[PDB]
Amino acid sequence: YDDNECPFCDEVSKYEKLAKIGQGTFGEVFKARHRKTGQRVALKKVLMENEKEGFPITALREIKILQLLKHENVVNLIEICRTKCKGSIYLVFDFCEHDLAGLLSNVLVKFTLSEIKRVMQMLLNGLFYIHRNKILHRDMKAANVLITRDGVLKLADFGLARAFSLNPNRYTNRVVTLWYRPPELLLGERDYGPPIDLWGAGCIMAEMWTRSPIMQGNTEQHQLALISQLCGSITPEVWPNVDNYELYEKLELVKGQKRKVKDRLAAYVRDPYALDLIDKLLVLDPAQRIDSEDALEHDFFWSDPMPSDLKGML
Amino acid sequence: NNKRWYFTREQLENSPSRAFGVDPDKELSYRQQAANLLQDMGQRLNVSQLTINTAIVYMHRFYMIQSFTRFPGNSVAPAALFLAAKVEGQPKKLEHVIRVAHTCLHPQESLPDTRSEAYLQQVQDLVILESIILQTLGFELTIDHPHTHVVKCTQLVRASKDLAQTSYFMATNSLHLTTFSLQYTPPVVACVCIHLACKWSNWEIPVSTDGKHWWEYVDATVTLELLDELTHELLQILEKTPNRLKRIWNWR
Ligand SMILES: CC(=O)N[C@@H]1CCC[C@H](C(=O)Nc2cc(-c3cnn4c3CC(C)(C)C4)c(Cl)cn2)C1
């Protein structure tokens, strides 16, 4: 209240705003510099649009999750800062120099098979951790995967993440960006789990060679169609019990499509193991889709050339 | 930090409120009144005891930083509970919390018109105060209660429903009546509660085959000397609390 003691909440003024780095799909993210040490950080402002119920419950959730998740492959919340009418709140994270979407959209950037192996390894290890801690990321995409100047991958943007549990769960279906959204969600599933993040891992893995999102739908129907043109068609034979809320109840799906995952990517990938793992990630039935644990065990991470450190690039 | 919200008795003596001339015993009463208001409102709002307990820890911690002279309990309690209900996933609407806080504090008064400037202001006062709480606590809102550890222990001791239920009662009342939450870790406070419940019920937990006392399996730091010191403190405040001990009194 203008002149109130606040030992554990520092004013954001301690950091110097250098550049906006979130204008596309997200709210207010800034690259900033600690005014005394020079430490680079990222400042995410907590948005107060239609916040009629005080401090956003959504932000309380994200903060709770960020405080819980402490791992080499998960972004690190340093602290929460205030700003001394009305006054804002910022989430302060250690800055990461690159993002997978950026490196992939850069023709000059080039990955060896060894480094692609490493990227996937860190990503899947991050996912294993978060899931082990009963958290679903729910927003898997190249742009949400960051890489430090030292080649350490971090899962970022937990704003849509949520805790999950073990009669049925009614989690939100308004989850995951369309291109990365798994079949389950597109078919209206609300009792989903960690396999949603793995489908997203699959899309990203394939993107490491194609350099472009493999399935770029415009609507849920277009997305479902695109998925069918790649993974074969949604069949109770392929996906036991798929025939339950749609499949026939409108959502006009294909019927003749046959799996072309390995054929369509055969060009770009070439490595047998990489193609096999992608095939096991982009599985229709969430229950038959490989988990992070088994994916990490896959021969792709345990055959030559073995995973190597990131120097490509710089 | 690990010791951020744990204080020595000297640190508890030199509190923010003490700096503005509030006697130690007066400050303890201000804390007990706030915990009672939180319990009263919480019951009416139909939130869990867990939510109420979380709001009580917020209050306790809040007043290790702020003074009762600047922030009255009757203003902080509704904001603390509004926050705790959101944190603990039982969100209650702002208008709702305001209506309940008002009836608890002014039974004979009538809630202002939800269109009045006086009502619009008290809505804003809550929001402002929730924000001051978040910042005082430095956004560390995840609370470990000792009830978690009591359940663990009362099973790993094979206690009657009765013994376990008496222990939970001790745990809840230790939040209302003491500052143990600002001094001892929840596993330690849990040991204090189980110990007192046993003394009250004339229950004796037998020594393990190894020669280890039950509490050694709960917290390595814990000593019988401390347990007896703390159970005595808790029992004395409980004897001072009318009708509280009646709740656990075996009349047979
Ligand atoms: C101007 C400049 O140097 N541009 C660089 C271009 C490459 C990527 C780099 C970056 O994005 N770095 C970053 C972002 C975050 C963060 C926090 N919230 N979200 C993100 C990005 C987001 C879009 C996922 C939303 C964090 Cl925590 C750390 N480092 C910024």
Coordinates of C-alpha atoms and ligand atoms in Angstrom, one line a residue:
Chain A
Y1 CA 0.0 0.0 0.0
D2 CA 2.4 2.7 -1.5
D3 CA 5.0 2.4 1.4
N4 CA 4.6 -1.3 2.6
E5 CA 7.5 -3.6 3.6
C6 CA 8.2 -6.4 1.0
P7 CA 11.4 -8.3 1.7
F8 CA 10.6 -11.3 -0.5
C9 CA 9.1 -9.6 -3.6
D10 CA 11.6 -7.4 -5.4
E11 CA 10.7 -4.6 -7.8
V12 CA 11.3 -5.7 -11.5
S13 CA 13.2 -2.4 -11.9
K14 CA 16.3 -4.5 -10.8
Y15 CA 16.3 -5.9 -14.3
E16 CA 16.7 -3.7 -17.4
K17 CA 14.3 -4.4 -20.3
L18 CA 16.3 -5.1 -23.5
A19 CA 13.7 -6.4 -26.0
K20 CA 10.2 -7.8 -26.4
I21 CA 10.5 -11.5 -27.4
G22 CA 6.7 -12.6 -27.1
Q23 CA 4.2 -10.8 -29.4
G24 CA 3.3 -13.9 -31.4
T25 CA 0.5 -15.9 -29.7
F26 CA 1.7 -14.9 -26.2
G27 CA 1.2 -11.8 -24.0
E28 CA 4.2 -9.9 -22.6
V29 CA 7.7 -11.6 -22.6
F30 CA 10.9 -9.4 -22.4
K31 CA 14.6 -10.2 -22.6
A32 CA 16.2 -8.3 -19.7
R33 CA 19.6 -7.7 -17.9
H34 CA 20.2 -7.7 -14.2
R35 CA 21.4 -4.1 -13.6
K36 CA 24.3 -5.2 -11.2
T37 CA 25.6 -8.5 -12.5
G38 CA 24.5 -8.4 -16.2
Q39 CA 22.7 -11.8 -15.8
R40 CA 20.3 -12.2 -18.7
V41 CA 16.7 -13.2 -17.8
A42 CA 13.2 -13.4 -19.4
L43 CA 10.4 -11.4 -17.8
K44 CA 6.9 -12.7 -18.3
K45 CA 4.2 -10.2 -17.2
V46 CA 1.1 -11.7 -15.5
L47 CA -1.8 -10.4 -17.6
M48 CA -4.8 -8.8 -16.0
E49 CA -7.3 -8.6 -19.0
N50 CA -10.8 -9.6 -17.6
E51 CA -9.6 -10.3 -14.1
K52 CA -12.6 -9.7 -12.0
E53 CA -11.6 -12.2 -9.3
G54 CA -8.3 -10.7 -8.1
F55 CA -5.0 -12.4 -8.8
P56 CA -5.4 -14.8 -11.6
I57 CA -6.1 -18.4 -10.5
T58 CA -4.4 -19.4 -13.8
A59 CA -1.2 -17.5 -12.8
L60 CA -1.3 -19.1 -9.3
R61 CA -1.4 -22.6 -11.0
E62 CA 1.6 -21.8 -13.4
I63 CA 3.6 -20.4 -10.5
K64 CA 2.8 -23.5 -8.3
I65 CA 3.9 -25.7 -11.2
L66 CA 7.1 -23.6 -12.0
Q67 CA 8.0 -23.8 -8.3
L68 CA 7.6 -27.6 -8.2
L69 CA 9.5 -28.4 -11.5
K70 CA 13.2 -28.3 -10.9
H71 CA 15.1 -30.1 -13.7
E72 CA 17.9 -29.5 -16.2
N73 CA 15.5 -29.8 -19.1
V74 CA 12.7 -27.6 -17.6
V75 CA 12.7 -23.8 -17.7
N76 CA 13.7 -22.2 -14.3
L77 CA 11.6 -19.6 -12.5
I78 CA 14.2 -17.5 -10.6
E79 CA 11.7 -15.3 -8.7
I80 CA 8.5 -13.2 -8.9
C81 CA 8.8 -9.4 -9.2
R82 CA 6.3 -6.6 -8.5
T83 CA 6.2 -3.0 -9.8
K84 CA 5.7 -0.2 -7.1
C85 CA -3.5 3.2 -9.4
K86 CA -2.7 -0.4 -10.6
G87 CA 0.6 -2.4 -10.7
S88 CA 1.9 -5.5 -12.5
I89 CA 3.7 -8.8 -11.6
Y90 CA 6.5 -10.6 -13.5
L91 CA 7.8 -14.1 -13.6
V92 CA 11.6 -14.0 -13.9
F93 CA 13.3 -16.9 -15.8
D94 CA 16.9 -17.7 -16.6
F95 CA 17.3 -16.6 -20.2
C96 CA 17.8 -19.2 -23.1
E97 CA 19.5 -17.9 -26.2
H98 CA 17.6 -20.0 -28.9
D99 CA 14.3 -21.7 -29.6
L100 CA 13.7 -24.9 -31.7
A101 CA 11.2 -23.1 -34.0
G102 CA 13.9 -20.5 -34.8
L103 CA 16.9 -22.8 -35.3
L104 CA 14.7 -25.0 -37.5
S105 CA 13.4 -22.1 -39.6
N106 CA 17.0 -21.1 -40.2
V107 CA 18.6 -22.4 -43.4
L108 CA 22.1 -21.6 -42.2
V109 CA 21.6 -23.8 -39.0
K110 CA 22.5 -27.5 -39.6
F111 CA 22.1 -30.5 -37.3
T112 CA 24.0 -33.8 -37.5
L113 CA 22.2 -37.1 -36.8
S114 CA 24.2 -37.1 -33.5
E115 CA 22.9 -33.7 -32.3
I116 CA 19.2 -34.5 -33.4
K117 CA 19.6 -37.6 -31.1
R118 CA 20.7 -35.3 -28.2
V119 CA 17.9 -32.8 -28.7
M120 CA 15.3 -35.6 -28.6
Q121 CA 17.0 -37.1 -25.6
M122 CA 16.8 -33.9 -23.5
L123 CA 13.2 -33.3 -24.7
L124 CA 12.0 -36.8 -23.7
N125 CA 13.9 -36.6 -20.4
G126 CA 12.1 -33.3 -19.6
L127 CA 8.8 -34.9 -20.4
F128 CA 9.6 -37.9 -18.3
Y129 CA 10.4 -35.6 -15.3
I130 CA 7.2 -33.4 -15.6
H131 CA 4.9 -36.4 -16.0
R132 CA 6.6 -38.3 -13.1
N133 CA 5.6 -35.1 -11.1
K134 CA 2.0 -35.5 -12.3
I135 CA 2.1 -32.5 -14.6
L136 CA 0.8 -32.4 -18.2
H137 CA 2.5 -29.7 -20.4
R138 CA -0.4 -29.4 -22.8
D139 CA 1.3 -27.0 -25.2
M140 CA 4.1 -29.0 -26.9
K141 CA 5.5 -27.1 -30.0
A142 CA 8.9 -26.2 -31.4
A143 CA 8.5 -22.6 -30.3
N144 CA 8.0 -23.7 -26.6
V145 CA 11.3 -25.7 -26.7
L146 CA 14.3 -23.6 -25.8
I147 CA 18.1 -24.3 -26.0
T148 CA 20.7 -22.5 -23.9
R149 CA 24.0 -21.1 -25.3
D150 CA 25.5 -24.3 -23.8
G151 CA 23.3 -26.6 -25.7
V152 CA 20.9 -27.5 -22.9
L153 CA 17.2 -27.9 -24.0
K154 CA 14.5 -26.6 -21.7
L155 CA 10.7 -27.2 -21.9
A156 CA 9.1 -23.7 -21.7
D157 CA 5.7 -22.0 -21.3
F158 CA 3.8 -23.9 -18.6
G159 CA 0.8 -21.4 -18.8
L160 CA -1.4 -24.2 -20.1
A161 CA 0.2 -26.9 -17.9
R162 CA -1.9 -28.7 -15.3
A163 CA -1.6 -31.3 -12.6
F164 CA -3.2 -34.7 -13.3
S165 CA -4.3 -37.7 -11.3
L166 CA -5.0 -41.5 -11.0
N167 CA -15.1 -41.5 -11.3
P168 CA -13.4 -40.2 -14.6
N169 CA -11.3 -37.1 -15.1
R170 CA -12.8 -34.1 -16.9
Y171 CA -9.8 -32.1 -18.1
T172 CA -10.2 -29.2 -20.6
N173 CA -10.3 -30.2 -24.4
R174 CA -9.3 -26.6 -25.4
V175 CA -5.6 -27.8 -25.1
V176 CA -2.6 -27.8 -27.4
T177 CA -2.0 -25.8 -30.6
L178 CA -3.9 -27.4 -33.6
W179 CA -0.9 -28.6 -35.6
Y180 CA 0.5 -30.4 -32.5
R181 CA -2.9 -31.6 -31.2
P182 CA -3.3 -35.4 -30.8
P183 CA -6.2 -37.4 -32.2
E184 CA -7.8 -38.0 -28.8
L185 CA -8.4 -34.3 -28.2
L186 CA -9.7 -33.9 -31.8
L187 CA -12.2 -36.8 -31.1
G188 CA -13.3 -35.0 -27.9
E189 CA -11.4 -36.8 -25.1
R190 CA -11.4 -35.2 -21.6
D191 CA -9.9 -38.1 -19.6
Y192 CA -6.4 -37.9 -21.3
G193 CA -2.9 -38.1 -19.9
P194 CA 0.8 -37.9 -20.7
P195 CA 0.4 -39.4 -24.2
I196 CA -0.8 -36.0 -25.5
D197 CA 2.7 -34.5 -24.8
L198 CA 4.3 -37.4 -26.6
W199 CA 2.3 -37.0 -29.8
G200 CA 3.7 -33.4 -29.7
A201 CA 7.2 -34.9 -29.2
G202 CA 6.6 -37.0 -32.4
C203 CA 5.6 -33.9 -34.4
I204 CA 8.7 -32.1 -33.2
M205 CA 11.0 -35.0 -33.9
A206 CA 9.8 -35.3 -37.5
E207 CA 10.2 -31.5 -37.7
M208 CA 14.0 -31.9 -37.0
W209 CA 14.4 -33.3 -40.6
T210 CA 11.4 -31.8 -42.5
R211 CA 12.3 -28.3 -41.0
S212 CA 8.5 -27.6 -41.1
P213 CA 5.4 -28.7 -39.1
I214 CA 4.4 -32.0 -40.8
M215 CA 0.6 -31.5 -40.4
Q216 CA -0.6 -27.9 -40.8
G217 CA -4.4 -28.0 -40.5
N218 CA -6.8 -25.1 -40.6
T219 CA -9.7 -26.6 -38.6
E220 CA -10.1 -29.7 -36.4
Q221 CA -11.7 -31.5 -39.3
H222 CA -8.7 -30.5 -41.6
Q223 CA -6.3 -31.6 -38.8
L224 CA -8.1 -35.0 -38.4
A225 CA -7.9 -35.5 -42.2
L226 CA -4.2 -34.5 -42.4
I227 CA -3.5 -37.0 -39.5
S228 CA -5.4 -39.8 -41.5
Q229 CA -3.4 -39.0 -44.7
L230 CA -0.2 -39.7 -42.6
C231 CA -1.0 -42.3 -39.9
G232 CA -3.6 -44.3 -41.7
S233 CA -7.3 -44.0 -40.9
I234 CA -9.0 -44.1 -37.4
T235 CA -10.2 -47.7 -37.1
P236 CA -11.5 -49.6 -34.0
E237 CA -9.1 -52.3 -35.4
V238 CA -6.2 -49.9 -35.2
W239 CA -7.5 -47.9 -32.2
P240 CA -9.7 -50.3 -30.0
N241 CA -12.8 -48.5 -28.8
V242 CA -12.2 -45.3 -30.9
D243 CA -15.9 -45.7 -32.0
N244 CA -17.4 -43.9 -29.0
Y245 CA -18.3 -40.1 -29.3
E246 CA -17.7 -39.3 -32.9
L247 CA -15.8 -41.4 -35.7
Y248 CA -19.5 -41.9 -37.1
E249 CA -21.2 -39.0 -35.1
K250 CA -20.4 -36.5 -37.9
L251 CA -16.6 -35.7 -37.9
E252 CA -16.6 -37.0 -41.5
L253 CA -13.5 -39.1 -41.5
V254 CA -11.7 -41.0 -44.3
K255 CA -12.0 -44.8 -44.7
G256 CA -9.3 -46.0 -47.2
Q257 CA -6.2 -44.2 -45.8
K258 CA -3.1 -46.4 -45.1
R259 CA -0.1 -45.6 -42.8
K260 CA 2.5 -43.6 -44.8
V261 CA 4.5 -42.2 -41.7
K262 CA 7.7 -44.1 -42.7
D263 CA 7.2 -43.6 -46.5
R264 CA 6.5 -39.8 -46.5
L265 CA 9.4 -39.1 -44.0
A266 CA 11.7 -41.8 -45.6
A267 CA 13.1 -39.0 -47.8
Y268 CA 14.2 -36.6 -45.1
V269 CA 15.1 -38.9 -42.2
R270 CA 16.9 -41.9 -43.9
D271 CA 18.1 -43.3 -40.5
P272 CA 16.0 -46.5 -39.7
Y273 CA 16.0 -46.0 -35.9
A274 CA 14.8 -42.4 -36.2
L275 CA 12.0 -43.4 -38.5
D276 CA 11.0 -46.3 -36.2
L277 CA 10.8 -44.0 -33.1
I278 CA 8.8 -41.3 -35.0
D279 CA 6.4 -44.1 -36.1
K280 CA 6.0 -45.2 -32.4
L281 CA 5.4 -41.5 -31.3
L282 CA 2.8 -40.7 -34.0
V283 CA 0.6 -43.6 -33.0
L284 CA -3.2 -43.1 -33.2
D285 CA -4.2 -45.0 -30.0
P286 CA -2.9 -43.0 -27.1
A287 CA -2.7 -46.3 -25.2
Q288 CA -0.4 -47.8 -27.9
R289 CA 1.7 -44.6 -28.2
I290 CA 5.2 -45.0 -26.8
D291 CA 5.9 -43.3 -23.4
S292 CA 8.9 -41.0 -22.6
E293 CA 10.5 -43.9 -20.6
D294 CA 10.4 -46.4 -23.4
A295 CA 11.2 -43.8 -26.0
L296 CA 14.4 -43.0 -24.1
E297 CA 15.2 -46.8 -24.2
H298 CA 14.7 -47.0 -28.0
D299 CA 17.8 -48.1 -30.0
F300 CA 17.8 -44.6 -31.7
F301 CA 19.6 -43.3 -28.5
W302 CA 21.8 -46.4 -28.1
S303 CA 23.3 -47.0 -31.6
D304 CA 26.0 -45.2 -33.6
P305 CA 26.4 -42.3 -34.0
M306 CA 25.7 -41.9 -30.3
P307 CA 24.1 -38.6 -29.0
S308 CA 26.5 -35.7 -29.0
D309 CA 26.8 -32.2 -27.5
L310 CA 25.4 -29.0 -29.1
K311 CA 28.0 -26.9 -31.0
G312 CA 25.9 -26.9 -34.2
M313 CA 25.3 -24.0 -33.5
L314 CA 27.3 -21.7 -32.9
Chain B
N1 CA 15.1 -20.4 1.6
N2 CA 14.5 -23.5 3.9
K3 CA 14.6 -21.4 7.2
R4 CA 12.9 -18.3 5.7
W5 CA 9.6 -18.9 7.5
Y6 CA 11.0 -20.5 10.7
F7 CA 11.8 -18.2 13.6
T8 CA 13.6 -18.3 17.0
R9 CA 11.6 -17.3 20.1
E10 CA 13.7 -14.1 20.2
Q11 CA 12.7 -13.4 16.5
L12 CA 9.1 -14.1 17.6
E13 CA 9.5 -11.7 20.5
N14 CA 10.9 -8.9 18.2
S15 CA 7.9 -9.1 15.8
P16 CA 6.7 -6.3 13.5
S17 CA 3.7 -5.7 15.8
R18 CA 6.1 -5.5 18.9
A19 CA 7.9 -2.6 17.1
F20 CA 4.5 -0.7 17.2
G21 CA 3.9 -1.3 20.9
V22 CA 1.8 -4.5 20.8
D23 CA 2.4 -6.7 23.8
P24 CA 3.4 -10.3 23.2
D25 CA 0.2 -11.7 24.7
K26 CA -2.0 -9.2 22.8
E27 CA -0.3 -10.3 19.5
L28 CA -1.0 -13.9 20.3
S29 CA -4.7 -13.0 20.9
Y30 CA -4.8 -11.0 17.6
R31 CA -3.5 -14.2 15.9
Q32 CA -6.1 -16.4 17.7
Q33 CA -8.9 -14.0 16.7
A34 CA -7.8 -14.1 13.0
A35 CA -7.7 -18.0 13.1
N36 CA -11.2 -18.0 14.6
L37 CA -12.6 -15.6 11.9
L38 CA -11.0 -17.8 9.2
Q39 CA -12.6 -20.9 10.7
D40 CA -16.0 -19.1 11.0
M41 CA -15.9 -17.8 7.4
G42 CA -14.5 -21.0 6.1
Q43 CA -17.3 -23.0 7.6
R44 CA -19.9 -20.7 6.1
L45 CA -18.2 -20.7 2.7
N46 CA -18.1 -24.5 2.8
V47 CA -14.3 -24.7 2.1
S48 CA -12.2 -27.6 3.5
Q49 CA -10.3 -27.5 6.9
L50 CA -7.2 -27.8 4.7
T51 CA -8.1 -24.5 3.0
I52 CA -8.8 -22.9 6.4
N53 CA -5.5 -24.2 7.7
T54 CA -3.6 -22.9 4.7
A55 CA -5.2 -19.4 5.2
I56 CA -4.1 -19.6 8.9
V57 CA -0.5 -20.2 8.0
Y58 CA -0.7 -17.3 5.5
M59 CA -1.9 -15.1 8.4
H60 CA 0.8 -16.3 10.8
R61 CA 3.5 -15.7 8.2
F62 CA 2.0 -12.4 7.1
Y63 CA 2.3 -11.0 10.6
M64 CA 6.0 -11.9 10.9
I65 CA 6.4 -9.2 8.2
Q66 CA 3.5 -6.8 8.7
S67 CA 2.1 -5.2 11.9
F68 CA -1.4 -5.7 13.4
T69 CA -1.2 -1.9 13.9
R70 CA -1.2 -1.4 10.1
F71 CA -3.2 -4.4 8.9
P72 CA -6.1 -5.5 11.2
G73 CA -6.9 -9.2 11.4
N74 CA -10.5 -8.5 10.3
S75 CA -9.2 -7.1 7.0
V76 CA -6.4 -9.7 6.3
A77 CA -8.4 -12.8 7.2
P78 CA -11.0 -12.5 4.4
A79 CA -8.2 -11.7 1.8
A80 CA -6.1 -14.7 3.2
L81 CA -9.0 -17.1 2.9
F82 CA -10.0 -15.8 -0.6
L83 CA -6.4 -16.5 -1.7
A84 CA -6.1 -19.9 0.1
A85 CA -9.4 -21.1 -1.5
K86 CA -7.9 -20.3 -4.9
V87 CA -4.6 -21.8 -4.1
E88 CA -6.2 -25.0 -2.6
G89 CA -8.5 -25.4 -5.7
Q90 CA -11.8 -24.5 -4.0
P91 CA -12.1 -21.0 -5.5
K92 CA -14.8 -18.9 -4.0
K93 CA -16.1 -15.8 -5.8
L94 CA -15.0 -12.4 -4.5
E95 CA -18.7 -11.2 -4.0
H96 CA -19.3 -14.4 -2.1
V97 CA -16.3 -14.0 0.3
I98 CA -17.3 -10.4 0.9
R99 CA -20.9 -11.2 1.7
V100 CA -19.7 -13.9 4.3
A101 CA -17.0 -11.8 5.8
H102 CA -19.6 -9.0 6.3
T103 CA -22.1 -11.3 8.1
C104 CA -19.4 -12.6 10.4
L105 CA -18.1 -9.2 11.3
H106 CA -21.5 -7.3 11.3
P107 CA -24.4 -9.7 12.0
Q108 CA -26.8 -6.9 12.7
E109 CA -25.8 -4.7 9.8
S110 CA -27.1 -5.2 6.2
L111 CA -24.8 -5.8 3.2
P112 CA -24.6 -2.5 1.2
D113 CA -26.1 -2.4 -2.2
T114 CA -23.8 -4.1 -4.7
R115 CA -24.1 -0.9 -6.8
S116 CA -22.9 1.5 -4.0
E117 CA -19.5 3.2 -3.9
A118 CA -19.0 1.8 -0.4
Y119 CA -19.5 -1.8 -1.6
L120 CA -17.4 -1.2 -4.8
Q121 CA -14.6 0.0 -2.4
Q122 CA -14.7 -3.0 -0.1
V123 CA -14.4 -5.3 -3.1
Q124 CA -11.3 -3.3 -4.1
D125 CA -9.9 -3.4 -0.6
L126 CA -9.9 -7.2 -0.6
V127 CA -8.2 -7.4 -4.1
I128 CA -5.5 -4.9 -2.9
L129 CA -5.0 -6.9 0.3
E130 CA -4.7 -10.3 -1.5
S131 CA -2.0 -8.7 -3.5
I132 CA -0.2 -7.4 -0.4
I133 CA -0.4 -11.0 1.0
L134 CA 1.0 -12.6 -2.2
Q135 CA 3.9 -10.1 -2.0
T136 CA 4.6 -10.5 1.7
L137 CA 4.8 -14.3 1.3
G138 CA 6.9 -13.8 -1.8
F139 CA 4.5 -16.0 -3.7
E140 CA 5.5 -19.1 -1.6
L141 CA 1.9 -20.4 -1.2
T142 CA 2.4 -24.1 -1.1
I143 CA 1.9 -25.1 2.6
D144 CA 2.9 -28.3 4.2
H145 CA 0.5 -29.0 7.1
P146 CA 1.3 -31.4 9.8
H147 CA -2.0 -33.3 9.2
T148 CA -0.3 -35.0 6.2
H149 CA 2.4 -36.4 8.6
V150 CA -0.1 -37.4 11.4
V151 CA -2.0 -39.7 9.0
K152 CA 1.4 -41.3 8.1
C153 CA 2.4 -41.8 11.7
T154 CA -1.0 -42.9 13.2
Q155 CA -0.9 -45.7 10.7
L156 CA 2.8 -46.6 11.2
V157 CA 1.8 -46.8 15.0
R158 CA -1.5 -48.8 14.4
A159 CA -3.6 -46.2 16.4
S160 CA -7.4 -46.5 17.0
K161 CA -9.7 -44.3 14.9
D162 CA -10.1 -42.4 18.1
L163 CA -6.3 -41.8 18.6
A164 CA -5.9 -40.7 15.0
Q165 CA -8.9 -38.4 15.2
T166 CA -7.7 -36.9 18.5
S167 CA -4.3 -36.2 16.8
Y168 CA -5.9 -34.4 13.8
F169 CA -7.8 -32.3 16.4
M170 CA -4.5 -31.4 18.1
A171 CA -2.9 -30.5 14.8
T172 CA -5.8 -28.2 13.8
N173 CA -5.9 -26.5 17.2
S174 CA -2.1 -26.0 17.2
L175 CA -2.7 -23.7 14.1
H176 CA -5.5 -21.7 15.9
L177 CA -3.8 -21.5 19.4
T178 CA 0.0 -21.5 18.8
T179 CA 2.8 -20.2 16.6
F180 CA 4.3 -23.7 16.3
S181 CA 3.8 -23.3 12.5
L182 CA 6.4 -20.4 12.6
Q183 CA 8.8 -22.5 14.8
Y184 CA 8.7 -26.2 14.1
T185 CA 8.6 -28.2 10.9
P186 CA 5.3 -30.0 10.2
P187 CA 6.7 -33.5 10.9
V188 CA 7.8 -32.2 14.3
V189 CA 4.5 -30.5 15.0
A190 CA 2.9 -33.9 14.0
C191 CA 4.9 -35.7 16.6
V192 CA 3.8 -33.1 19.3
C193 CA 0.2 -33.8 18.3
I194 CA 0.5 -37.6 18.4
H195 CA 2.4 -37.4 21.7
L196 CA -0.3 -35.2 23.4
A197 CA -3.2 -37.3 21.9
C198 CA -1.5 -40.4 23.5
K199 CA -1.1 -38.7 26.9
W200 CA -4.8 -37.5 26.7
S201 CA -6.1 -41.0 25.8
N202 CA -3.7 -42.9 28.1
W203 CA -2.3 -44.7 25.0
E204 CA 1.2 -46.0 24.9
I205 CA 3.0 -46.6 21.7
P206 CA 5.5 -49.6 22.3
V207 CA 9.2 -49.4 21.5
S208 CA 10.2 -50.8 18.1
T209 CA 12.1 -54.2 17.9
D210 CA 15.2 -52.1 17.1
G211 CA 14.9 -50.1 20.4
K212 CA 13.7 -47.0 18.5
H213 CA 10.9 -44.7 19.7
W214 CA 8.0 -44.1 17.2
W215 CA 8.9 -40.4 16.6
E216 CA 12.5 -41.4 15.4
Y217 CA 10.8 -42.9 12.3
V218 CA 9.0 -39.5 11.7
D219 CA 11.8 -36.9 12.3
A220 CA 15.4 -37.4 13.2
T221 CA 15.8 -34.1 15.0
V222 CA 12.9 -34.9 17.5
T223 CA 13.7 -35.6 21.2
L224 CA 11.4 -36.6 24.1
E225 CA 12.5 -33.5 26.0
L226 CA 11.2 -31.3 23.3
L227 CA 8.0 -33.3 22.9
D228 CA 7.2 -33.0 26.6
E229 CA 8.0 -29.2 26.5
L230 CA 5.7 -28.6 23.5
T231 CA 2.8 -30.9 24.6
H232 CA 2.7 -29.1 27.9
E233 CA 2.5 -25.7 26.1
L234 CA -0.2 -26.9 23.7
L235 CA -2.2 -28.5 26.6
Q236 CA -2.1 -25.3 28.7
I237 CA -3.6 -23.2 25.8
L238 CA -6.2 -25.9 25.2
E239 CA -7.3 -25.8 28.9
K240 CA -7.7 -22.0 28.5
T241 CA -10.0 -22.6 25.4
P242 CA -13.6 -23.1 26.6
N243 CA -15.4 -26.1 25.2
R244 CA -12.4 -27.1 23.0
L245 CA -11.2 -30.0 25.2
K246 CA -14.9 -31.1 25.6
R247 CA -14.7 -32.1 21.9
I248 CA -12.1 -34.8 22.7
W249 CA -13.2 -35.6 26.3
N250 CA -13.9 -39.2 27.0
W251 CA -16.7 -39.3 29.4
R252 CA -16.9 -43.1 29.9
Ligands
LIG1 C1 15.6 -10.6 -28.8 C2 16.1 -12.0 -28.5 O1 17.2 -12.2 -28.0 N1 15.3 -13.0 -29.0 C3 15.5 -14.4 -28.7 C4 15.2 -15.2 -30.0 C5 15.5 -16.7 -29.7 C6 14.7 -17.2 -28.6 C7 14.9 -16.4 -27.3 C8 13.9 -16.7 -26.2 O2 12.7 -16.8 -26.5 N2 14.4 -16.8 -25.0 C9 13.8 -17.1 -23.8 C10 12.4 -17.1 -23.7 C11 11.7 -17.5 -22.5 C12 10.3 -17.4 -22.5 C13 9.4 -17.1 -21.4 N3 8.1 -17.2 -21.7 N4 8.2 -17.6 -23.0 C14 9.4 -17.8 -23.5 C15 9.3 -17.8 -25.0 C16 7.9 -18.3 -25.2 C17 7.4 -17.8 -26.5 C18 7.7 -19.8 -25.1 C19 7.1 -17.6 -24.0 C20 12.6 -17.9 -21.5 CL1 11.9 -18.4 -20.0 C21 13.9 -17.8 -21.6 N5 14.5 -17.5 -22.8 C22 14.7 -14.9 -27.6

